[PDB]
Structure formats: structure tokens, C-alpha cells
Amino acid sequence: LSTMLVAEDLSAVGGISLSSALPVLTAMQYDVAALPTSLLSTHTSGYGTPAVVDLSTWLPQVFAHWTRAQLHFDQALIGYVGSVALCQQITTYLEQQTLSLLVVDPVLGDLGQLYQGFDQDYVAAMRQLIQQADVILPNTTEAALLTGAPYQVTPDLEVILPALQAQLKTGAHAVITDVQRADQIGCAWLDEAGHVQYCGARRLPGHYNGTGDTLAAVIAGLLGRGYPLAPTLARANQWLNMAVAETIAQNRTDDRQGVALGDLLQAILALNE
Numbered sequence: 376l377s378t379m380l381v382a383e384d385l386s387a388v389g390g391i392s393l394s395s396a397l398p399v400l401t402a403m404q405y406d407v408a409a410l411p412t413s414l415l416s417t418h419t420s421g422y423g424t425p426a427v428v429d430l431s432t433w434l435p436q437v438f439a440h441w442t443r444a445q446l447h448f449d450q451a452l453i454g455y456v457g458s459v460a461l462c463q464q465i466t467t468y469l470e471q472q473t474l475s476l477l478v479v480d481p482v483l484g485d486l487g488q489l490y491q492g493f494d495q496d497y498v499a500a501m502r503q504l505i506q507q508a509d510v511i512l513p514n515t516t517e518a519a520l521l522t523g524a525p526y527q528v529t530p531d532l533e534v535i536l537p538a539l540q541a542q543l544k545t546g547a548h549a550v551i552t553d554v555q556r557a558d559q560i561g562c563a564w565l566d567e568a569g570h571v572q573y574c575g576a577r578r579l580p581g582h583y584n585g586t587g588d589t590l591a592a593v594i595a596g597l598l599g600r601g602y603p604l605a606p607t608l609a610r611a612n613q614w615l616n617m618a619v620a621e622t623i624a625q626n627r628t629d630d631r632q633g634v635a636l637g638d639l640l641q642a643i644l645a646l647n648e
């Protein structure tokens with residue numbers, strides 16, 4: 376079984392980030408190396424101020440250990456990192472690897488603004504991290520921050536997509552992930568001919584934690600199994616829609632918990648056969 380490094384935050388309570396990546400990627404037939412970039416009592420939306428461990432001095436030791444133990448990784452998914460130093464540490468470790476797949480979710484902001492504690496220093500560190508990525512999955516706010524364009528609710532995909540590509544290696548893909556078209560929500564990217572493609576599914580009411588994390592985990596898992604980008608995005612969006620639908624069907628009293636994974640895990644097992 377292939378090995379997938381996943382580096383992102385772990386919140387003990389919340390059902391998002393590394394806690395949701397582990398079940399998904401394990402079900403998708405990877406041996407997951409689950410590396411917290413931060414450790415939190417709960418995620419940061421709705422439980423009050425969480426108790427957090429700073430892992431900035433641990434990760435360097437982790438990479439040094441794996442290096443000496445002669446561990447090698449097939450594929451990697453990098454999610455929320457959270458500090459300039461950790462971005463830089465991850466960037467150089469990954470450069471030491473021969474990765475067949477690197478997916479970066481360049482978590483930086485939403486609704487037109489940087490997340491709290493993130494400033495243009497973090498933006499620069501992210502631009503360095505994405506340099507070897509095969510695929511990046513910014514939202515519309517993150518795309519604008521990376522290129523340095525002023526935020527637009529509806530940027531010109533014909534302008535912003537080439538601008539983003541200009542920072543990636545030849546053959547890599549910038550996929551913008553929360554693009555709305557009429558009643559749809561989905562992903563937009565440039566095909567090999569340079570034409571903007573859109574892949575979406577009918578938007579469901581409400582807002583749900585962990586959707587981007589699970590989308591990234593599914594995209595990484597599919598690409599890692601050799602599925603071309605377009606059918607990968609088609610399936611990820613279908614799966615993304617199905618998980619949100621199951622979440623709604625649970626009639627939850629607690630709106631903080633991340634998207635349900637049961638129907639998604641069932642779909643994965645069916646794909647495996």
C-alpha cells in the first residue's frame with residue numbers, strides 16, 4: 376500500500392482537518408502518515424478559545440528523524456500550516472523527497488480577508504510552499520492573495536487562473552474550489568488547451584465545517600491512484616455534495632461538527648470494489 380503524508384492541524388474535537396483526513400485516506404487504501412502542524416482542544420469556530428500546542432519546535436525534529444530513519448513518502452497533502460517557520464520547514468523537507476504527488480491547500484483566508492494572525496509574511500511563505508505542488512486548491516480569496524490581485528467576489532477566471540499558474544511548475548494545476556455558477560458550487564481550472572473548465576454540483580443550504588479539508592483529501596486520494604484531473608474533480612464534487620447532504624439529513628443540534636463521512640466512506644469502498 377502506498378504512503379500518503381498528510382500535514383495539517385489536528386483538533387481533538389471538531390471532526391475536521393486531520394481527524395477527517397485519516398478515515399478518508401485510510402479507506403482509499405493509503406498508509407497515512409498523519410502529521411499535526413498544530414494540536415488544538417477543539418477547532419476555532421464556536422467552542423470559545425481553544426487550548427493549543429505550538430509544534431514549531433517539534434516538526435523540525437520530526438523531519439530530521441524521518442530523514443535519519445530513511446523514510447520516503449510517495450505522495451503528500453499539505454493543509455493548514457499556520458506559521459512562516461513551519462511553512463519553510465515543510466517546504467525544504469518536501470524538496471528532499473522525490474514525490475509523485477504533492478497537493479497543497481493554501482489556507483490563508485475567506486470572504487475577502489486574511490484569517491486572523493495571517494499577514495503578508497504568511498502569504499510569501501505560502502508562495503514558496505506551492506512552488507513544487509502538482510495541484511493547489513485555493514478559494515477565491517486565496518487565489519487573489521497569492522497573485523497579489525485585489526479581492527473580487529467574481530474574479531475573471533481567464534485572468535486569475537493564468538496568473539496563478541505562473542507561480543506553479545510546468546504541468547501543475549491551480550484549481551479554484553468554491554466558484555459559484557447560478558445554483559452550482561464547484562471547481563474551476565485551465566485544461567491543457569488553456570480553456571477554463573468548471574465542475575460543480577447543486578449548492579445545498581447552510582455552511583459546513585471541514586468541506587475544504589475533505590475535498591482536498593479526496594482529490595489527493597484520487598490523483599494518487601492515477602485518475603486524471605477532470606474525472607477526479609467530477610467525482611470529488613459528487614462526493615462533496617453527498618457528504619453535505621448526509622450532514623443535513625442528520626438534523627444536528629450542534630452546527631460546529633465537520634461534515635459527515637459515512638456515505639463518503641461507503642462510496643470509497645464501492646470504488647475500491
Ligand SMILES: Nc1ncnc2c1ncn2[C@@H]1O[C@H](COP(=O)(O)OP(=O)(O)O)[C@@H](O)[C@H]1O
Nearest residue numbers: 552553561578579585586587588590612615619
Ligand atoms: N453548501 C454546500 N453545498 C454543496 N456543496 C458544498 C457546500 N459547501 C461546500 N461544498 C463542497 O465542498 C467543496 C469545498 O468547499 P470549499 O468552499 O472549497 O471549502 P472550505 O471553505 O472548507 O475550503 C466545494 O467545492 C463544494 O464541492
Ligand SMILES: [Mg+2]
Nearest residue numbers: 513514552587
Ligand atoms: Mg478551502
